[PDB]
Design a protein around this nucleic acid. Structure first.
Lengths: 83, 97, 92, 105, 105, 92, 97, 78
DNA sequence: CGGATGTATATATCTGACACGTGCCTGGAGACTAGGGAGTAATCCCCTTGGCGGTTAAAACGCGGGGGACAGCGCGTACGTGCGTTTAAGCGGTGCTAGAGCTGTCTACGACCAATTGAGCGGCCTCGGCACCGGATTCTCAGGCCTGG
DNA sequence: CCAGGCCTGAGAATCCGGTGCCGAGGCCGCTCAATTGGTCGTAGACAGCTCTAGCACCGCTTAAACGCACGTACGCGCTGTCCCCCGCGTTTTAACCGCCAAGGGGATTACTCCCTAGTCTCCAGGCACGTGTCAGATATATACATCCG
């Protein structure tokens, strides 16, 4: 099934909660579209690298190891999922 | 009736969500978004639950760091409220396109 | 006797723009750029053969290293060039 | 009878030298036969792209010899080349001219 | 009659396993005898430092097991440890509690 | 089977804090940290051996790699610990 | 006559952006480098190429830092760059904790 | 010796960076930042020289240190 | 809209850096072997995808309003700009020597292989530290009343 | 007429004791990787030799830097307005948990073929050196733009 317009699943309360964890006291109403775009760009980069690793591995499933390698590629090392 | 003056609930939410260690994004919507982005590259891609959890952790950490930088920019602009120009400036200084 | 890419860079420059020359500093910069790209690609190929228990580095490894290193259109064109070169080498 | 590997692939960069570099860097226990050819092709394409942009800049500056300033102008004006070379600084290259509208009168 | 290389160096971390990892990683053609011992010593020192600060955090939070939150608190409270791990994300760790002074009444 | 540092980290933890335990997620994070530092040291030692045209990795190479990869106080204590361990190993 | 404040600044900006020549005096930079290295190892000799490389790197770094500082100043609705702008730029970039 | 980085030189660097107006304390701030940068790079270069069993700092050592800080330099050997 | 300060320009010049010819030696190419690694075909079974409903927690919507962003305005000062004087950077000619760079030896260090055995990994099971929770206790938060001003 | 208290209600955060549950931490069996003793080859430690270049010094020139005066543009504080997030209540919806089923691909094994490392042998591409010559930097004069008086 083709997936369309799933970026709205990151709702306004989710962005607000992430901002609150980041120390934000007041949030403007236009922040959510920019945050959705930024998250989309970041996810496209990481997923592109992950799919490159998966396709090299001659696999049809993405692995946590692939995501971790992609995040090292972006210099965003993640601890707790292997490596 | 009873009424908190604005700001108090925001500060309390800041404290609660900085004390907590739980993922703030709904798992099923995040998974659907990840699979959409993936099928934009290679069709018929399966995923692992650990892989989706890793992606969610990375995305939440990235967004929280970006929001810290945005808050710094907003305070620099003598503002309490964060605005999209703050995010744009933060990303430009970091070196993201 | 330091080994450089001076002759080959000069040949490429004369093949692209025959009426434009090159300076010694510019050749040094181009040599450094070629070297740096070479180590980037080779290191990402080694750190990609290591994660699949593969003792060998092949055209597939170099291709995925190019895809990981270079940006989009640049990697697409580089992959086309490498595929054409390997096809010519196999034919000849 | 000694046909060079570069001629066999229609390339200018040294396939044999790249093979020697790859084998002396110990990047892997074994090296495939197509890896040096692929590396030479990619390197030659990148050099050709950079040199073409640099020569265009040199012509725009009414000069017939590429200098580090021309190289840096080409790299900073090409989007993908600038993304590839972002933390890299070029000796005797300077910066792109950029004065924003706020500063301008 | 068999004394482990860890015991000779007075260490806990596996000198033999570190040796095997170094040789399998193909970092150099030849490996010295003191390289695995030195690397094991450095690794155990770093682990001891991180674990000591994490246990201090766990004891401060009136608990008895180290969790990712305690590890992250230790990392972000130690200046040199945070400098070493500035670009590292700790899963299930959250953020260090920090509210800017301007935002407070 | 999969190889981790759980036993060794538990021994170190019981040395430093005898009355404090550790969870599985914390062990995973510590194992990842140890592997990350091991790679960050071994790659640097390899590149220094390449730079100095030296086929071997020695305690001196690891000492200078540690000085390169760790901040000041950490490097000082790590060098002290490594020198002590190597001296003890040579004596025994 | 006297130029108004800003015209000479703009002409200097164009002049120093069209050029590719070092803006720091070579001998003072050499003395500063030697003074800094005196705190790491006594009796160090240097190479002219080494000092030139250090000078190029320092100039490039400072130019980038000043670009980011100007961005921050414009964000704060200012033409003047101030130490708080440099501090914010370094904080976002990651040099300052 | 830090005073050798004069106010006009910092102004020139700012102009190449695109600064139209400079405050007073920017010079002291710039001197401190430059000192930190040079300390880091020189520390790594001296470490490389010591590992080489030398006493002269070379451009290759400086270039390798700069590559460590994620800021490569083309023109001096790479 | 004048002028002086600058950038750009036309042209001579002179020049030193770039392009080309030449000799030699080192690294590249060809040939043959052999041996292990890659590709292919089968099979298992485990994990991933997909459908349902139910209760329910979170998202969505609406609304009063109050706190904050944003524009306008005036004041003082700090920075830009220009000129005279002073300081030392730059050049370049000399001398000295510490040390980079390479060579020769010989020896100790490390690779390598076979046999042995103990350490570490998977699996299992019990118990206590920790998540959850409803009564009690205290801690910030916000509107209000009569008196002090 | 304004404030500034304590008051004092009032939700929220903290403390505390109970109970229960499942994951931490220990034990057992086994297996496979670390250890050990021996041999062989060469990498490096050490000592000499040489000669590039790095350092110290001097003197002359003049170009950049310092100091000071003057003025005006801008940073900043304040004020008024209007609006747009915030907090809270009510309705909707689809996340989530549990359970089941299907099947597809990841892992493993086995077999075969051919691709590459290794070694030797020949000879020409590439590098260092020398030398010619022309694109460009420079000195200097000039037409052109422009921003402040």
């Amino acid at each position: 099934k083709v997936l369309r317009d799933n970026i709205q699943g990151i709702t306004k309360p989710a962005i607000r909660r992430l901002a609150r964890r980041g120390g934000v006291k007041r949030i403007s109403g236009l922040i959510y579209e920019e945050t959705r775009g930024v998250l989309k760009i970041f996810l496209e980069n990481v997923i592109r690298d992950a799919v490159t690793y998966t396709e090299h591995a001659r696999r049809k499933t993405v692995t946590a190891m692939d995501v971790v390698y992609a995040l090292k590629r972006q210099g965003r090392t993640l601890y707790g999922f292997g490596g | 009736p009873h009424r908190f003056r604005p700001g108090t609930v925001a500060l309390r939410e800041i404290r609660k969500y900085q004390k907590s260690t739980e993922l703030l994004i709904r798992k099923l919507p995040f998974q659907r978004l990840v699979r959409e982005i993936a099928q934009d590259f290679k069709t018929d891609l399966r995923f692992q639950s650990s892989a989706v959890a890793a992606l969610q952790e990375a995305a939440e950490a990235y967004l929280v760091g970006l929001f810290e930088d945005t808050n710094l920019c907003a305070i620099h602009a003598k503002r309490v409220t964060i605005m999209p120009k703050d995010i744009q400036l933060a990303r430009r200084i970091r070196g993201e396109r | 006797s330091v080994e450089t890419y001076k002759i080959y860079i000069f040949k490429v420059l004369k093949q692209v723009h025959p009426d434009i020359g090159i300076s010694s500093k510019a050749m040094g910069i181009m040599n450094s750029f070629i070297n740096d790209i070479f180590e980037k690609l080779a290191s990402e190929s080694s750190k990609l053969a290591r994660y699949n228990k593969k003792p060998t580095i092949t055209s597939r490894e170099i291709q995925t290293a190019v895809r990981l290193v270079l940006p989009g259109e640049l990697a697409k064109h580089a992959v086309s060039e490498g595929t054409k070169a390997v096809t010519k080498f196999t034919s000849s | 009878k000694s046909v060079s590997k570069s001629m066999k692939a229609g390339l200018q960069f040294p396939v044999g030298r790249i093979t020697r570099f790859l084998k002396k860097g110990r990047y892997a226990q074994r090296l495939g036969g197509g890896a040096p050819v692929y590396m030479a092709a990619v390197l030659e394409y990148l050099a050709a792209e950079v040199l073409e942009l640099a020569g265009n800049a040199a012509r725009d500056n009414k000069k017939s010899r590429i200098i580090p300033r021309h190289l840096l102008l080409a790299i900073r004006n090409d989007e993908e080349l600038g993304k590839l070379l972002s933390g890299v600084t070029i000796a005797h290259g300077g910066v792109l001219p950029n004065i924003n509208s706020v500063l301008l009168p």
